[PDB]
């Protein structure tokens, strides 16, 4: 189960935001995103990384009809991958792992088979000018309720950073440490 900081998200919702310095936003050709979670929800946004580049690039981990999935867009089309079978909303700890290299991507939950997505046609490869990581909710999305831990995004252990009141972190709403 979890290592390090855990946040509980209670009814009504809350959101932790990591905001990169505006003159030092990363653009990446490959990404790794993982998070640990426990919940009984059927619909929730867990994590979303948004860009400031006006190109619309994004990466989102969410639960839909009780199943964990990823949707992302690095410039071409919206790519959606769902782990359609793993039970993830039994209130027990689960880990979801996402990777991307260019336009290709994988998703895996727990010890279930890795899902490998190789989209057809022209694909862009850079996740441009990443501006914010939002955790536990988003504008136009349904807020997470449960516990989140072990958020790793391209090397950043975001929830541990939140736990020490990193200066790039903001926390709002109904969410608290452990
Ligand atoms: Ca792009």
Gap between the Cα atoms of 148 and 73, Å rounded = 24
CA 55 to chain centre: 19
Triad 74, 64, 130: Cα angle to 5°: 25
| Residue positions forming the annotated binding site for Ca(2+) | 57, 74, 126, 128
58: how many CB neighbours lie within 10 A of its CB? 17
Tell me if 156 sits within 8 A of 13, measured CB to CB. Answer: no
Reduced to 3 states (helix: H, G, I; strand: E, B; else coil), residue 99 is strand
* Experiment used for this model: X-ray
Whole-number Å distance, alpha carbon 3 to ligand 1 midpoint, is 33
| Residue positions forming the annotated binding site | 57, 74, 126, 128
Whole-number Å distance, alpha carbon 125 to ligand 1 midpoint, is 6
Q: Which neighbouring-strand residues pair with 86?
A: none
Triad 159, 139, 61: Cα angle to 5°: 50
Gap between the Cα atoms of 19 and 118, Å rounded = 30
Whole-number Å distance, alpha carbon 51 to ligand 1 midpoint, is 9
1-178 belongs to CATH 2.60.120.200:
yes
Q: Which neighbouring-strand residues pair with 31?
A: 100
Neighbours of ion ligand 1 (CB under 5 A): 57, 74-75, 124, 126, 128
């Amino acid at each position: 189960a979890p290592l390090g900081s855990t946040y509980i998200f209670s009814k009504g919702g809350g959101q932790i935001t990591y905001k990169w310095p505006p003159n030092d936003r990363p653009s990446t050709r490959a990404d790794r995103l993982a998070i640990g979670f426990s919940t009984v929800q059927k619909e929730a946004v867990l994590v979303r990384v948004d860009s400031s580049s006006g190109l619309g690039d994004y990466l989102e981990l969410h639960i839909h009809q009780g199943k964990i999935g990823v949707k992302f867009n690095v410039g071409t089309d919206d790519i959606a991958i769902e782990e359609s079978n793993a039970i993830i909303n039994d209130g027990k700890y689960h880990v979801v792992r996402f990777t991307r290299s260019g336009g290709n991507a994988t998703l895996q939950v727990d010890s279930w088979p890795v899902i490998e997505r190789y989209p057809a046609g022209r694909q862009l490869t850079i996740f441009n000018s990443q501006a914010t990581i939002i955790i536990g909710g988003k504008e136009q999305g349904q807020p997470f309720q449960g516990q989140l831990s072990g958020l790793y995004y391209n090397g950043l252990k975001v929830l541990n950073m939140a736990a020490e009141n990193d200066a790039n972190i903001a926390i709002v709403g109904n969410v608290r440490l452990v």
